[PDB]
Amino acid sequence: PIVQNIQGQMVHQAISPRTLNAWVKVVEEKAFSPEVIPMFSALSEGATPQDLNTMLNTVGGHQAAMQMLKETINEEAAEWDRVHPVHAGPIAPGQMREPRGSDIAGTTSTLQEQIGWMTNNPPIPVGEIYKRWIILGLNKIVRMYSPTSILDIRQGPKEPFRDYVDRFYKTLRAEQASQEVKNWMTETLLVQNANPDCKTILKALGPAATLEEMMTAC
Amino acid sequence: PIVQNIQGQMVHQAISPRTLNAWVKVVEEKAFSPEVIPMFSALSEGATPQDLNTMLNTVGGHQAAMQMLKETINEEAAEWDRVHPVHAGPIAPGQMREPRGSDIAGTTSTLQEQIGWMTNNPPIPVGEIYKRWIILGLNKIVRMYSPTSILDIRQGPKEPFRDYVDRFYKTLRAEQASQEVKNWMTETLLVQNANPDCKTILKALGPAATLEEMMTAC
Amino acid sequence: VNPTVFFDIAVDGEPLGRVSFELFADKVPKTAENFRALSTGEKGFGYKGSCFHRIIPGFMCQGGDFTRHNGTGGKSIYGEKFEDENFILKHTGPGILSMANAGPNTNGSQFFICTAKTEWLDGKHVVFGKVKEGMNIVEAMERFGSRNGKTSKKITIADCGQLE
């Protein structure tokens, strides 16, 4: 990682063990719950591609998942290189070589080079952009580890509405839908796949109620 | 091959199918006997590498034998490349390059190039060089299958001296031993492996008899 | 920017004149860099006092064998040979500079200087620079070649380096 507390540009530190024991542990005991994504983000803050690789490789279990995550990275890395022309002659004075799909995944670039582009003005933030590729992977992976699918959720007649919204939310959180749809699902779809006695009370209550009231109906 | 005078006009045409039937036939008929070798030589007059390859490719039998041979040929091809560096820099119009081991093998070259080499002044006989690299592997394949050791040739109790000589000389043929070691063997070992009653007669013609004076007796 | 490099050309001892070259370092960086550093001799070896061993009228003039002197020697500044870097530049006509090699991946220090348009060399020899001044001295050089490449005079890079 990079050290926060230095006012100068780009002073760095060898990766904590505690950071890596906790990553392995949340992967062991949370089983790719969507909760893994903000957690992974607290841990990976301030980190480099060498360090994000060191993190990726450290997980010995789960090797299918790990191969899927790397397939995400390489697809993004192919995209990254497809989009950009990339200059092949000597660089002009005071300036540096612009980073490829391999340089951000940290396979051709070395630690010194990774440091160079974050030093620079504009910085190119290769730890962030590699972490973006890793979060985009894990967002696929969590959905996949989650059995439930949002339209297959429907309230039993005898099922409490607190219990039903809990599982609805859990299923919705894991899904990968556009915002506007999610707004519509939370407005009309949720109430329409409720049970009729419950939906009869929810309609009676009306749409002008608080969500606090809506949870204490039925 | 080259056809109608190797020092003539230098007319060329394909390896005859009449050559090929006689060639497939004789390995079928005669195995890896050393008799297929001058048979190979007399078929291959003025032949290109492309012609020689067709001889090997068409056979369809003997695929371990052929493999062991093609491996032996590639070792001689490799020696040629190793011994000869090519002089660096581009080919002039009207001129032609120095041939490597796989060029004479016919694998990194075409007939147009082979004819060039073969019909330059003075002629560079790449066909001949590669025919010898075949025959050097044939000699080894012959020897592999060869009737049992010469040093173990010993006249039998119901066996004439003529048949013994026969058998002795037939083993001397598929032996690749020096013609000096073979002469000394024809002289010494012949007699000292002969049967007592025959050896006596043989010794009693004295030292340094002609085979005919020996065969006349015994 | 790549600084222009020159060779001084002498023939049999007697000077013949000077050749100047410009190298396409922006297209072809370690090939251009190789012929530039072997021009200075900053690495303790290079083209200075090494004969032109293959000269052929209306095709090319070849040199940079500084070890054997015969067309089987030469070595890159990187040691041994190097990979064909980029084959973008065409052999577009006389004064083109391009890398003599024995088939794939053999570019040492040897090169050849086009005195005709040689279109069949595109994709086999990397074009890595082009003649700046002194092309008619390479016309004077060619006169001392023969059809097989055999030189009938000793043709020698007297001095070489780079230009501000």
Residue numbers in the entry:
A (entry chain B), B (entry chain A): 1 to 218
C (entry chain C): 1 to 164
Copied sentences from the primary study:
To elucidate the molecular interactions between CypA and the HIV-1 capsid, we determined the structure of CypA in complex with an HIV-1 CA tubular assembly at 8-Å resolution by cryoEM. The density map, combined with structure-guided molecular dynamics (MD) simulations, unexpectedly revealed a novel, non-canonical, second capsid-binding site on CypA that is vital for stabilizing the viral capsid. To determine the structure of the CypA-CA tubular assembly complex, we chose the CypA-CA ratio and assembly conditions that yielded homogeneous complexes suitable for cryoEM: pre-assembled CA tubes with CypA added at 2:6 CypA:CA molar ratio. First, among the three CA helical arrays in the assembly (dashed black arrows denote the three directions along which helical tubular arrays are formed, each direction corresponding to a different curvature), CypA binds preferentially along the most highly curved array. For these reasons, we suggest that a single-CypA molecule spans two CA hexamers in the tubular complex. The MD simulation revealed, beside the first binding interface at the canonical CypA-binding site, a second binding interface between CypA and CA, comprising residues A88, G89 and P90 from CA, and A25, P29 and K30 from CypA (site 2). The interaction at the second, non-canonical CypA-binding site is weaker than at the canonical binding site, as shown from pair interaction energies −16.1±7.3 and −28.9±17.0 kcal mol−1, respectively, obtained from unrestrained CypA simulations (simulation 4—Supplementary Table 1). We conclude, therefore, that CypA likely employs both binding sites to strengthen the CA dimer interface in the CA assembly, thereby stabilizing the viral capsid. On the other hand, a high level of CypA reduces capsid stability and disrupts the capsid assembly. These seemingly contradictory observations can be explained by steric hindrance between two CypA molecules upon simultaneous binding to neighbouring CA hexamers, thus weakening, at high concentration, the dimer assembly interface.
